[PDB]
Structure formats: structure tokens, C-alpha cells
Amino acid sequence: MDAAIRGNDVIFVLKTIGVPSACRQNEDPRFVEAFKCDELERYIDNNPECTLFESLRDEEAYSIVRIFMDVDLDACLDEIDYLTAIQDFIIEVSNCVARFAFTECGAIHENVI
Amino acid sequence: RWEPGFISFEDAIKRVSKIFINSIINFNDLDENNFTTVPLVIDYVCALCKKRSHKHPHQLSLENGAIRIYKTGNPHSCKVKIVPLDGNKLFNIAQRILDTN
Numbered sequence A: 001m002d003a004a005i006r007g008n009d010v011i012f013v014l015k016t017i018g019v020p021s022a023c024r025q026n027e028d029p030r031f032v033e034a035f036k037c038d039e040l041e042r043y044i045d046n047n048p049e050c051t052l053f054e055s056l057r058d059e060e061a062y063s064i065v066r067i068f069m070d071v072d073l074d075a076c077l078d079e080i081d082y083l084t085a086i087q088d089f090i091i092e093v094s095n096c097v098a099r100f101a102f103t104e105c106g107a108i109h110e111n112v113i
Numbered sequence B: 001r002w003e004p005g006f007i008s009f010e011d012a013i014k015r016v017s018k019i020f021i022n023s024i025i026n027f028n029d030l031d032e033n034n035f036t037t038v039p040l041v042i043d044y045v046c047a048l049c050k051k052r053s054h055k056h057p058h059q060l061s062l063e064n065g066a067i068r069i070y071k072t073g074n075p076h077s078c079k080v081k082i083v084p085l086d087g088n089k090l091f092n093i094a095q096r097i098l099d100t101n
């Protein structure tokens, strides 16, 4: 566990979709940029019209990321049913990820849960 | 030209009472045809959320053979509980037999 493995407070963000990797590795100011939490906070406050797509600089050293998911349902739910669905969703997903980690990564199931 | 097809209403009421750690004040006020309407008053002693007290009362809803308990006002404050009501009769018989020890 190194400093980059310890934590990574600097973030990297794109401005649109379909940016070629050549521009990204050429640190093209029109597409890629580097920020911190506070810097991006004032950026998004000052320029709401922009589109910001956060990602990694490279997969070689900063492979560590928080576990994240995107859910997209073509419907609308009332609040109480939404809460029930989110509770069932969170229990099932937490279980599934923990079990995968236990059976492959050799981690403690209960710690992950 | 409430449906008691699965278990008794008093069994559902006592299950709801057991789930609530705090006492239930208006348990007697609940009948076969008011449980979806009569708000619930607890004795605080709320387990579902571990909070000391709640500004708004809980309520019961019957949905596809289940009793769902949710707190009024802002539902996000207190967790929603689900109780299964449909029951295999051959299982209720076993439960009754084990009740006698």
C-alpha cells in the first residue's frame, strides 16, 4: 500500500463524450482537465451549463475506486414503494458483492457487508 | 349475473405488535376494516429506525398479501417494514402445534 494506494485526492474530468485517447494522453485542454474537490465545486457552481465526466488518469497506478453502480428504470415509483425497492436492492447487492469478494478476493465477507 | 384467506387478522395484529419494540396504544382500535386507515400510535420506548421518537405516526398498507408499515410525513426518516401474510395452511398447523410445546 503506497501513497497512491493510500488515497488519491486529485481528480480528472472530461467535458464531453467520445474523446479519443490520443487527446487524453496529450492532455488536451478542450477535453480533459485536472481538479480537486473545492476547485470542481466552484467550477460546477460557476459554470452549470458544462458537462463533466469524472474518470481516472490511467489504470496503471490508480486502479483503486469506490464501488459504484448506475440504475436506470423507464418508470416512476411513489416514495414508499421506492424505499422498499431500494432497501431490497441494497441488501441483495451488498450480499452479492461481498460473496464475490469472499470467493475470489479472499476477503472477509462480514467486513465487506 | 382484509381477506382472511391465508391467516387470521389477530395473528397479523400480534405480529405487528411483536415487531414494534415499543408498545402499541391503539391496537384495540384496529378492526378488520380500518387497518389501512387508522394511524398507529406507538409508546416510543422506534425500532425500525432506532430513533428516540418520531414526529409522525406509522401506518399499515395491504399489498399483494403483505402488510407494509411506513411512517407518515417524510417516509425517509423511518425505515419501511414488510410483513408476509400469505401462509401455507400446512405450515400454520405446524406453528400451532409447536406453540403448545
Ligand SMILES: [Zn+2]
Pocket: B046, B047, B048, B049, B050, B051, B053, B054, B071, B077, B078, B079
Ligand atoms: Zn423511526
